[PDB]
Design a protein around this ligand. Structure first.
Ligand code: EOJ
Ligand code: MG
Ligand code: ZN
Length: 342
């Protein structure tokens, strides 16, 4: 069995120092997707160690090793919502910790919950969104459609299922107040990854940024966790052009695959899901203008050291504008043929 041997090394070999992973591993300029997938579970352990969670919370190391592997194995392989996404999201959480002084805003246990939630937040994603669950009358919709955020409720339930798996509950020694607290936080944070939810609370996020963060305000803690989570989720937009280009490719591969299924079901996909109608440059520009840039603007507003993240997203949006003309075919196509018009 592969996993048990991967577990045996991961447990008995020792945890690699984060600097050995990459000299810039803790920089906002580092691209975690550069790390070979076979190195990612070790890197998760390294980050947990470097953030001092393992020591602070006295996490059992066999339990933690099993948990991390179980979480990795809990992702399928659609083009975008796979383990490497969850890993890069978690890595960004680690970046926020190393670069922004979260401990001035958040309790230790909240920061811990944020990171674990990042690892788990898209568990068992099938490459389809919430509307598709209802449209296709999936089992997940049958469970959760009356509450909404179907996929995110499922991700959370899957995280819980992993914790409830023997030898995997990294929290089982917690006091009952802390155990209850961690699971409540995981619920809130994972549910916050539904963009419908972000869009609902965006004005509360603005109000908070405008009046200024109040560490004595429990609502401010909740709101900030939501914003940080979303910041991790979209953090591919904060790297270089190449990262944004590739991730747009993975995203639309996934979207158009869903759209193809919708057409087979006799439904009209959303424009952005329809490979015959979607114009990727304007769609990506819309996403960056209406969703990604405001999120990092808020992040910068709350954390002045996050300024570079916003300017990076803004710059990447500019690049989409600059390359948009390449989506128009000028001259003949590469094969010198107009056959494709037929
Ligand atoms: C690069 C990139 N583009 C993205 C373009 C579009 C959408 C997207 O779901 N847009 C919306 C647009 C309106 C209002 C809501 C609900 C629906 C209608 C669909 C959101 C997401 C995009 N996205 C994400 C991402 C983040 C969280 C969950 C799922 C995903 Cl896919 N991560 N990266 C990207
Ligand atoms: Mg998700
Ligand atoms: Zn995600």
């Amino acid at each position: 069995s592969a996993m048990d041997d991967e577990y045996t090394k991961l447990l008995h070999d020792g945890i690699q120092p984060v600097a050995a992973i990459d000299s810039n591993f803790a920089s906002f300029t580092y691209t975690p997707r550069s790390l070979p997938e076979d190195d990612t579970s070790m890197a998760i352990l390294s980050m947990l160690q470097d953030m001092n969670f393992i020591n602070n919370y006295k996490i059992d190391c066999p339990t933690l090793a099993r948990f991390c592997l179980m979480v990795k194995k809990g992702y399928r392989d659609p083009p975008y919502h796979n383990w490497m996404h969850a890993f890069s999201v978690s890595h960004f959480c680690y970046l926020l910790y190393k670069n922004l002084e979260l401990t001035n805003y958040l309790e230790d246990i909240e920061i811990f919950a944020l990171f674990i939630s990042c690892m788990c937040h898209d568990l068992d994603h099938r490459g389809t969104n919430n509307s598709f669950q209802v449209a296709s009358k999936s089992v997940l919709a049958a469970l959760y459609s009356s509450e909404g955020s179907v996929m995110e409720r499922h991700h959370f339930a899957q995280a819980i299922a992993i914790l409830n798996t023997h030898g995997c509950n990294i929290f089982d020694h917690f006091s009952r107040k802390d155990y209850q607290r961690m699971l409540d936080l995981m619920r809130d944070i994972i549910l916050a990854t539904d963009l419908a939810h972000h869009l609902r609370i965006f004005k509360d996020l603005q109000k908070m940024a405008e009046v200024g963060y109040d560490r004595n305000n429990k609502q401010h803690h909740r709101l900030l966790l939501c914003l940080l989570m979303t910041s991790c989720d979209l953090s591919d937009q904060t790297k270089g052009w190449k990262t944004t280009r590739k991730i747009a490719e993975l995203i639309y591969k996934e979207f158009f695959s869903q759209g193809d299924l919708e057409k087979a079901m006799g439904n009209r996909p959303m424009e952005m899901m329809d490979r015959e109608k979607a114009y990727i440059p304007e769609l990506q520009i819309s996403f960056m203008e209406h969703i990604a840039m405001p999120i990092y603007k808020l992040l910068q507003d709350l954390f002045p050291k996050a300024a570079e993240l916003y300017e990076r997203v803004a710059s990447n949006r500019e690049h989409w504008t600059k390359v948009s003309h390449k989506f128009t075919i000028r001259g003949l196509p590469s094969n010198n043929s107009l056959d494709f018009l037929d």
